[PDB]
A paper describes a structure:
Thousands of outer-arm dyneins (OADs) are arrayed in the axoneme to drive a rhythmic ciliary beat. The tail is permanently attached to the MTD A-tubule, while the head region of each HC contains a microtubule-binding domain (MTBD), which binds and releases the MTD B-tubule depending on the nucleotide states.
Cryo-EM classification reveals that the OAD arrays adopt two distinct microtubule-binding states, MTBS-1 and MTBS-2. In both states, the relative axial positions for α- and γ-MTBD are fixed on MTD (γ-MTBD is always 8 nm ahead), while the β-MTBD position is equivalent to either α-MTBD in MTBS-1 or γ-MTBD in MTBS-2. In MTBS-1, β-HC adopts a post-1 linker docking mode, which is precisely switched to post-2 along with β-MTBD stepping forward. On the other hand, α-linker fits well into a groove (groove-1) formed by AAA3S, AAA5E and β-CT-cap in MTBS-1, while β-linker matches another groove (groove-2) between γ-AAA2S and γ-AAA3S. The TTH interactions between OAD0 and OAD+1 sterically restrain the nucleotide-induced allosteric response of OAD+1 and its downstream neighbors.
Numbering used by the authors:
A (entry chain E): 12 to 62
B (entry chain J): 16 to 110
C (entry chain K): 4 to 93
D (entry chain L): 14 to 111
E (entry chain M): 1 to 87
F (entry chain O): 13 to 132
G (entry chain D): 61 to 209
H (entry chain N): 4 to 117
Amino acid sequence: KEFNNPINFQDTETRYGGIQNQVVNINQYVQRNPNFIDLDNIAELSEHSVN
Amino acid sequence: QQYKTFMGARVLWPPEAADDILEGAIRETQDALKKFEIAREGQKIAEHLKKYMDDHFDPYWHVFFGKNFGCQAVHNKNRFIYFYIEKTAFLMYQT
Amino acid sequence: HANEQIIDMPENSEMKSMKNDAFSQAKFAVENYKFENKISSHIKKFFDEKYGPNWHCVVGKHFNAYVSYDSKNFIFFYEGQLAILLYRKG
Amino acid sequence: EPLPPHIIRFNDMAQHLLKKVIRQADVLIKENPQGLEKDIALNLVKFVKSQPEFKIGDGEWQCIIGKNFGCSLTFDANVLAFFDLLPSRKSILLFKSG
Amino acid sequence: MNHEPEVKATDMEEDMIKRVKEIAINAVKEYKQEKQIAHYIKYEFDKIDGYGWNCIVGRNFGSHIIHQTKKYIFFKINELCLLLWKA
Amino acid sequence: RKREASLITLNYIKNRFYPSKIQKIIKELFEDRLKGVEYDPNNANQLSERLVLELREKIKRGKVPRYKIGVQVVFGEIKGQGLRIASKCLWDVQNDNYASYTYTSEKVYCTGIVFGCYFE
Amino acid sequence: LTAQELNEDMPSKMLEPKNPQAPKNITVYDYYTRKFKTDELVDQMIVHFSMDGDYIWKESNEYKTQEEIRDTKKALIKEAMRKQESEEPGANHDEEAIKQTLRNKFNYNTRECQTINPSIRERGVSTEPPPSDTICGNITQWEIFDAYY
Amino acid sequence: TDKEYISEEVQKAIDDSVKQVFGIKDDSSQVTITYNKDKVNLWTQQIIDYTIRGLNKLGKHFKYCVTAILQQTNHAGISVQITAYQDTNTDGSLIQCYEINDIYAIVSVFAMAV
């Protein structure tokens, strides 16, 4: 008829994400003499009217 | 516009505020109103609630409850709570 | 008939333009729009245009309110029967 | 070793250095409360400059303290410390720009 | 309407100060957000005045910052305060 | 309140305050099991799994039953390595929710995303 | 963008991509526009953990820029070293001292600037409408006429 | 069986999305797009929309949660793990890890009955 939960709902299965290991050099240079970061302190505002 | 009844109170169903800050908020007003009445000494219970919000949540809450009013206000993301109880409608928003 | 107001506006340093436009707008806003929410949308929009943003105003026939504001930006006046409240914060 | 209440937005700095800045920053705001942000900024830059083994070179220590400010700065690698003290509720930006 | 800014504290050349208020009106209309405004100023000022540069856009703040000589300018637009400098 | 009694018919919902309640529950567990912040070898990956199994049961304990729980944990080393873990779930608006918490140490970061979907 | 039919002619509902937790709208005051500006459409996409980290690869576009910055700073240090070594006889100034020697009082002034912030203040305002009194009046033909007479 | 969940179909949907963003495929690195801090923020929003749209097309009456994890040029021991409190003979979930030149990206998909 309408929507009822008598059916057992318990069972649990996991899976295991990962990535494949590579070379140490990686052909990349750590960090930049300077670095560019744009830091806000203000919290994004939104207006709602209620009567 | 569509209201809803949760924790013995009539709130705007799409809960603008986060559902933890809202639950603790409504419950404090109901436990404030069980002590002080709106009809007699109605200024006091607002100032009690305003200070309470600043203690448990971020500061500079504005508190506005009346039997009849209409407001359009700018608030922070998920920091707007508007609920009716019996006949009296309680608005408040963080800045 | 607006027996008891609360005026906490700057007044000094030709900022009476920002107090007088509270009494002036209110009168024009109330008679035309005739809807509590829409008043709070009109008065706010004006005061943001002229004196920069983060103004909150709340208009009701009967309401209680305790709030935090920016010193010398808060005015509470009765326009006729209606009771308009506007103030800056942030 | 106690550390006063604070909210990290972004910390691109060693923990040893950051902890030492926050302690000073809390004590320095507590000294002159309801005091101007530049007065607190000045004395904070003096401290971090004055303290030895705190220098990472390149630019020069320069601190910005406000309640409401967005920004975008070019700084030296692992030298920028942003934090906001919970009791004061005032953000503090401290870094070196080359 | 948005009237032209007013430079409070400044150390810029008669040619430069014009280019700053220029970039300032362009930036304010293009981007709404306070961080996005700053982000434009800098990246434009990285083409004209060499790699190193910095920009802040605060409604209410304070500081002291070390800047290269003739490469500092603080202009306050109507109810918003923009501080930029070099190195 | 006939419209309210009606509202229960279309969807029973049982909207148990999913966001911060779970966010508080996961936060409390993460701190205890992270133990040594310094430890991020290759033999702790197997131990980082064990964490995830424990997590999902405590989600059942924290006033969820009728909801359908799916949790994804990510445990990673940071070396100023710039990565962004975003998500977006196709669900019934205001009828389901998500819970997220991230714990950043000096040398290690652990983020726990928990998805709950109502079922009848 | 599909709809679920619910069994036994229940009110139809559906399932939308949009995350509900994300705010409905987002409003960010423009100074050019000079009035608050609302954006009904939102990015409606939740991020658990964001991390922007200094880390560049060999032969980027962003590396070349970093090299130029080093080469300019180096050139200024080299010139400043060489000029101090050329002017002075057998100069023993270290490269670290020469940099500190390059930053002057008339080559790096250090200004302080704050904005004028109004002190926050918390006030109460209770508005109670005029008292409303019950009145009871009866009117009969005689009482009208009695006054009229 | 018109409705029902299938392992292959989901994997195919994610492949198409990862291809749609930056994969001509064909067994040769015809493109190379190294991971910027600017482009990462855009890619996530692009990938996730494309994955959902992909799942939507063939979609039955399954709700779909998709999380996008990006990683800056590996070199950092990351381990992702997924568990679903859901009846077996009802739904299954899958994750698929991709190795696309400089950028490394893991995509997860939860399936929930309706």
